[PDB]
């Protein structure tokens, strides 16, 4: 969806709350 067919996992600019 959105702009990522992998499901928002590639090279994304956000930290996406990995911490």
C-alpha radius of gyration, the chain, whole number = 9
| Cα 12 to chain centroid, rounded | 5
| 12 in Cβ contact with 4 (< 8 Å) | yes
| 16 in Cβ contact with 9 (< 8 Å) | no
Distance (Å, whole) CA 2 – CA 11: 14
């Amino acid at each position: 969806c959105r702009k990522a067919g992998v499901g928002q996992s590639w090279k994304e600019n956000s930290p996406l709350n990995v911490s």
